[PDB]
Design a protein around this ligand. Structure first.
Ligand SMILES: O=C(O)[C@H]1O[C@@H](O[C@H]2[C@H](O)[C@H](O)[C@H](O[C@H]3[C@H](O)[C@H](O)[C@H](O)O[C@@H]3C(=O)O)O[C@@H]2C(=O)O)[C@@H](O)[C@@H](O)[C@@H]1O
Ligand SMILES: O=C(O)C1=C[C@H](O)[C@H](O)[C@H](O[C@H]2[C@H](O)[C@H](O)[C@H](O[C@H]3[C@H](O)[C@H](O)[C@H](O)O[C@@H]3C(=O)O)O[C@@H]2C(=O)O)O1
Length: 227
């Protein structure tokens, strides 16, 4: 009894350029499946026209993974000189009790390293300073370095919020509601890697594994200009 996001043509672009993974990295719907009305409890269109992702469990996800219009998986040079852009209007609801971090957008390499995660967090301590109920950027310092550089981007609100990621020329910038909150962070540690965008709900370190993380996107688009 779920309405498909494909019924809203504002999503045709991203669904044409995506595959849906749930609840692990396994694909449940490729782009043609998504365009042909795919819908489930973890991926459906709400009555006010958001594409809503929901998932329970530690490190479980309901997430779109960037594809090319041609059908190829996106695998763009992470530090290449063309603009690689993702843009989303995201409403982050107040999360269920026991949900402690939800990653909503990513840049991920073609192996096992997330270049960037943008996540909501209940509480985070960065260089000894604790922030509550914030949206964060986490950039991994290297493929062989588990540490990351973390930057608070926004106090959490339930209101629809525009997030833009621009990855270009070995730098990465994030704007939030039009304001630059991470300005040309260096991601040269990903030279020689290939990359792709992800978007949805990726549930990190919950303290209640039955609770659902839930994220809604009113608009979502992404572009990889091949050079
Ligand atoms: O506040 C810190 O910077 C904190 O980060 C700790 O390492 C983190 C790392 O920064 C990052 O958040 C990582 O995120 C995971 C993700 O949660 C998921 O589980 C998957 O593994 O991909 C991501 C990844 O591998 O980058 O999780 C790390 C963690 O320990 O939870 C430490 O560096 C710590 O010293 C520091 O205080
Ligand atoms: O999403 C993350 O940030 C995350 C952090 C962990 O450290 C891992 O890096 C994990 O990476 C995922 C990644 O998100 C993709 O889902 C990826 O999917 C590929 C898998 O090979 C699948 O088997 C599929 O066949 O192709 C997928 C693809 O490239 O699109 O899998 C990794 C992973 O699970 O290690 O998540």
């Amino acid at each position: 009894f779920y309405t498909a996001p494909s019924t809203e043509s504002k999503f045709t672009e991203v669904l044409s350029k995506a595959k849906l993974q749930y609840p692990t990295s396994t694909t449940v719907a490729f782009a043609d499946d998504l365009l042909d009305g795919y819908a489930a409890s973890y991926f459906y269109l709400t009555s006010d026209l958001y594409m809503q992702f929901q998932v329970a469990g530690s490190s479980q996800r309901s997430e779109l993974r960037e594809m090319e219009t041609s059908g190829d998986e996106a695998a763009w040079d992470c530090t290449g000189s063309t603009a690689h852009v993702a843009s989303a209007q995201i409403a982050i609801p107040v999360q269920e009790d026991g949900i402690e971090e939800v990653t909503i957008l990513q840049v991920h390499d073609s192996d096992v390293t997330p270049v960037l995660r943008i996540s909501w967090v209940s509480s985070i301590t960065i260089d000894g300073v604790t922030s509550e109920d914030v949206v964060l950027a986490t950039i991994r310092n290297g493929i062989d370095d588990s540490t990351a550089t973390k930057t608070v981007l926004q106090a959490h609100t339930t209101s629809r919020t525009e997030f833009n990621i621009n990855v270009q020329n070995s730098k990465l910038s994030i704007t939030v509601d039009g304001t630059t909150e991470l300005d040309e962070a260096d991601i040269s540690q990903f030279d020689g890697s290939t990359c792709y965008f992800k978007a949805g709900a990726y549930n990190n370190n919950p303290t209640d594994t039955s609770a659902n993380a839930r994220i809604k996107m009113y608009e979502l688009e992404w572009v990889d200009h091949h050079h």
